[PDB]
Amino acid sequence: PKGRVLLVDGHHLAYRTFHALKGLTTSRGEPVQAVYGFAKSLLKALKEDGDAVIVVFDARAPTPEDFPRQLALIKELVDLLGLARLEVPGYEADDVLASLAKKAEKEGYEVRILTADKDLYQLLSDRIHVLHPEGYLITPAWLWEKYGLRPDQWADYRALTGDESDNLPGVKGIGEKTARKLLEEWGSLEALLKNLDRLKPAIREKILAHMDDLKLSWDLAKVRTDLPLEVDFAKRREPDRERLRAFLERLEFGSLLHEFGLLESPKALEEAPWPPPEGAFVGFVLSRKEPMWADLLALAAARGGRVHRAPEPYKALRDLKEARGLLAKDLSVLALREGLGLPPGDDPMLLAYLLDPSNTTPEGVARRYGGEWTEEAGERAALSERLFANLWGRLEGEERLLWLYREVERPLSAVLAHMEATGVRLDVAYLRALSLEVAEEIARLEAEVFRLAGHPFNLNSRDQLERVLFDELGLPAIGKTEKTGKRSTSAAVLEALREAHPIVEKILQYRELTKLKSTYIDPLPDLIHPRTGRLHTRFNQTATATGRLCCCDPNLQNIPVRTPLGQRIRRGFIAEEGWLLVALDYSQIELRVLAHLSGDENLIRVFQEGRDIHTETASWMFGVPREAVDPLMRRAAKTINFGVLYGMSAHRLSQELAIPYEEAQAFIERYFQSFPKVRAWIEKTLEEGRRRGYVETLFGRRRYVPDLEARVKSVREAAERMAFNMPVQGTAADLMKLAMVKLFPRLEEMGARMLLQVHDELVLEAPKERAEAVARLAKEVMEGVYPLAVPLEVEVGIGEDWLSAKE
Numbered sequence: 001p002k003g004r005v006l007l008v009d010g011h012h013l014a015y016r017t018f019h020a021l022k023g024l025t026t027s028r029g030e031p032v033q034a035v036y037g038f039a040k041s042l043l044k045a046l047k048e049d050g051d052a053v054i055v056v057f058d059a060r061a062p063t064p065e066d067f068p069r070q071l072a073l074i075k076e077l078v079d080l081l082g083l084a085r086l087e088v089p090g091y092e093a094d095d096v097l098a099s100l101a102k103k104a105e106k107e108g109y110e111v112r113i114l115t116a117d118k119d120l121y122q123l124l125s126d127r128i129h130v131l132h133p134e135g136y137l138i139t140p141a142w143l144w145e146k147y148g149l150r151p152d153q154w155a156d157y158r159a160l161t162g163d164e165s166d167n168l169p170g171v172k173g174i175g176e177k178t179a180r181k182l183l184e185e186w187g188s189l190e191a192l193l194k195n196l197d198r199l200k201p202a203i204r205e206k207i208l209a210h211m212d213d214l215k216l217s218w219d220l221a222k223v224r225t226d227l228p229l230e231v232d233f234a235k236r237r238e239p240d241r242e243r244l245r246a247f248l249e250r251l252e253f254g255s256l257l258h259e260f261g262l263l264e265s266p267k268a269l270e271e272a273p274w275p276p277p278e279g280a281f282v283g284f285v286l287s288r289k290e291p292m293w294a295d296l297l298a299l300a301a302a303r304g305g306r307v308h309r310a311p312e313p314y315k316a317l318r319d320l321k322e323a324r325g326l327l328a329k330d331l332s333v334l335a336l337r338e339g340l341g342l343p344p345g346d347d348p349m350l351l352a353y354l355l356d357p358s359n360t361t362p363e364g365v366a367r368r369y370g371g372e373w374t375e376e377a378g379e380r381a382a383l384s385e386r387l388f389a390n391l392w393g394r395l396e397g398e399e400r401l402l403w404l405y406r407e408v409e410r411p412l413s414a415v416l417a418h419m420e421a422t423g424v425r426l427d428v429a430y431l432r433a434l435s436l437e438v439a440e441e442i443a444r445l446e447a448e449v450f451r452l453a454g455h456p457f458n459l460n461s462r463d464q465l466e467r468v469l470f471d472e473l474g475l476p477a478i479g480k481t482e483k484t485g486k487r488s489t490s491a492a493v494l495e496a497l498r499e500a501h502p503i504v505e506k507i508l509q510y511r512e513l514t515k516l517k518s519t520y521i522d523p524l525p526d527l528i529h530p531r532t533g534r535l536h537t538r539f540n541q542t543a544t545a546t547g548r549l550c551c552c553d554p555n556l557q558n559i560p561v562r563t564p565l566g567q568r569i570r571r572g573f574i575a576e577e578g579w580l581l582v583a584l585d586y587s588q589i590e591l592r593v594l595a596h597l598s599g600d601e602n603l604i605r606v607f608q609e610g611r612d613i614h615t616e617t618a619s620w621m622f623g624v625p626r627e628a629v630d631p632l633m634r635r636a637a638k639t640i641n642f643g644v645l646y647g648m649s650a651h652r653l654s655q656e657l658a659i660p661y662e663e664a665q666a667f668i669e670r671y672f673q674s675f676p677k678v679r680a681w682i683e684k685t686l687e688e689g690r691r692r693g694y695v696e697t698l699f700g701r702r703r704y705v706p707d708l709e710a711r712v713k714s715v716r717e718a719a720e721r722m723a724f725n726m727p728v729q730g731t732a733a734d735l736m737k738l739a740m741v742k743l744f745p746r747l748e749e750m751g752a753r754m755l756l757q758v759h760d761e762l763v764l765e766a767p768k769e770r771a772e773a774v775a776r777l778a779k780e781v782m783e784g785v786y787p788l789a790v791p792l793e794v795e796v797g798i799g800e801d802w803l804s805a806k807e
């Protein structure tokens with residue numbers, strides 16, 4: 001067989017489905033039952049496929065007023081899918097179909113015709129078959145077994161009957177046989193179609209008893225196999241994925257586009273029954289990325305390359321000991337919601353992320369190491385297996401990375417799944433009231449932007465902005481980043497100008513406050529899950545540059561710390577009815593980590609003594625006893641203690657404080673005079689960084705910094721910041737993650753739970769008559785997570801809302 005050809009009866013399929021799913025239309029009117037029906041059934045056959053696919057149409061007089069509208073969309077759909085369309089002017093779909101089937105058959109093709117209209121059953125033969133829109137595989141055997149006939153005599157058997165429209169009103173019966181129960185029993189000695197005179201009533205009587213009624217029933221044979229046409233059998237074209245999407249979304253059926261990805265699938269490997277062996281990698285497909293709000297569309301497993309596919313995903317989740325594969329965490333969150341305890345196991349992403357924190361997405365990890373992140377549960381599983389193979393083999397030779405995976409990454413996965421699957425209760429009543437409050441704050445600011453500038457224009461609509469600034473002129477350049485386009489303008493434009501004009505400042509206040517409101521106060525009440533009644537923030541274990549947890553929906557991280565609004569927003573997050581929120585926070589961990597990593601005895605000493613690092617630093621910088629340190633002094637000490645963390649720079653500090661460049665340089669000198677090892681540390685961090693090509697955290701977390709050795713000052717000053725900005729933050733991240741991993745086991749027994757983790761804070765939720773005890777357990781665990789040169793202090797709080805516990 002030179003191939004398989006799937007001939008589609010676009011014409012009769014389009015007609016059939018127009019008189020099916022009669023309800024379907026896009027919510028705005030626009031009917032869609034014909035397009036849908038056609039698309040759905042097309043896919044079914046295309047699932048079983050053929051090398052070459054040709055959709056035949058009629059190439060009007062009394063058809064439905066809406067039919068052609070939909071038929072035109074059907075063809076648009078055929079095109080956009082890269083399938084061959086064929087209509088020969090003057091020929092009826094069926095004739096072309098029959099003829100295409102014959103041609104392809106003769107040319108050494110196995111031909112499968114997707115149609116419902118029974119006429120084509122006469123062409124049934126080996127090579128040529130029929131796929132019913134409904135299902136089955138109408139074959140010649142199917143004819144003998146379910147009808148008792150053979151193709152050669154099936155358009156005949158159909159001529160003494162009448163389907164629908166195949167006009168023949170009158171059969172009688174005879175021994176109850178009607179014409180149908182008989183059908184085959186007239187095939188012995190023709191009569192109607194060749195010789196046979198005297199015979200029984202109906203059987204014969206009715207045959208001749210209907211002249212003219214037969215010189216129309218010949219329409220069954222309206223399947224001439226000799227239509228003169230060329231069109232050759234080529235394999236599928238490329239689909240217009242940009243417009244298939246635009247198309248489907250216009251009919252509101254973009255919702256099920258994923259199905260169409262399942263035809264351009266890289267050759268099916270070998271399979272096996274459902275329950276995959278213990279140790280197989282799972283692949284899965286969800287209706288939406290957010291696991292809590294998603295529907296598990298498909299679940300598959302891979303072992304040794306043999307893909308196993310679940311017949312029903314949900315019941316199937318019960319056959320797994322754990323979720324082992326890409327985005328394993330996301331499946332455990334779904335299973336959790338589904339009341340199933342399926343903990344996250346190995347995941348290639350965790351391995352990739354350790355080997356290199358630039359590996360942040362499955363799409364990219366997959367592409368980078370010889371694979372592809374598809375949308376088929378089965379391919380994502382096999383991919384999940386080869387990636388683990390390829391990647392475990394490398395990480396294996398690295399003890400520091402292996403330790404991290406085994407003691408931090410892998411178990412953090414399981415802790416992440418419970419936090420995401422648990423959610424936080426929100427005070428929706430407060431969210432709405434708060435929104436009322438914040439709405440007006442924005443109003444007054446817009447009003448003031450009209451009160452001044454005169455013409456009450458509308459902010460944000462960037463066309464105006466330029467204009468209001470021509471009615472009161474003042475406009476130069478910005479800097480070097482983001483240049484000239486309408487985006488590079490809205491990016492850095494105006495900021496430079498906020499300085500001396502209230503109008504260009506109130507504009508910031510508005511423009512920004514709306515974002516904070518739209519990002520943190522409005523989406524929130526809507527993110528309250530129906531089944532849980534809680535918001536389920538999402539936690540990405542990989543994602544960041546420092547190794548810090550990334551969260552989204554909402555990004556708690558970017559919620560403004562220590563401001564009238566950020567504080568107001570945290571009040572939104574509340575404790576369950578009879579529970580209390582326990583927020584624990586690591587006081588100055590980056591500094592306690594810098595002291596450890598630098599080894600600076602004076603830094604180590606302050607933390608050991610239990611002293612205020614900003615006052616002490618001020619003492620040794622401005623030569624006055626701690627008791628005599630004044631507000632300004634502790635202010636310069638606090639910022640330098642803050643700036644040293646990422647170097648900052650003399651000018652930066654010179655600017656962060658109202659001080660001549662000169663004085664800021666002296667301040668830095670004094671800082672390193674009191675902290676020599678801190679300077680030495682930075683110096684060496686960049687050396688090993690430059691030599692080795694990467695830096696690390698206390699625990700071994702690597703980040704490649706090639707740009708330390710650049711040409712452009714502006715550029716080697718970037719890599720240099722990040723260069724030591726990672727060991728410090730990286731170490732602080734690692735201590736938190738590890739803390740979470742130790743603490744988790746004990747909150748279960750304490751009946752408490754872990755909710756959020758932002759910056760260097762961990763928010764727990766515990767039963768009222770438990771909160772105090774849980775708080776003390778967590779402080780212990782957190783403080784003694786890992787032995788460093790100085791103590792670790794955890795400021796803790798308890799309360800009904802996140803803002804009560806405060807930090």
Ligand SMILES: CCCCCCCCO[C@@H]1[C@@H](O)[C@H](O)[C@@H](CO)O[C@H]1O
Nearest residue numbers: 619620621622623624666669670673
């Ligand atoms: C121990 C208490 C010290 C009291 C404050 C000391 C301030 C000294 O500050 C000076 C800088 O201004 C000088 O340029 C540098 C580098 O050569 O030496 C520093 O010690």
Ligand SMILES: [Zn+2]
Nearest residue numbers: 009012094117
């Ligand atoms: Zn047909």
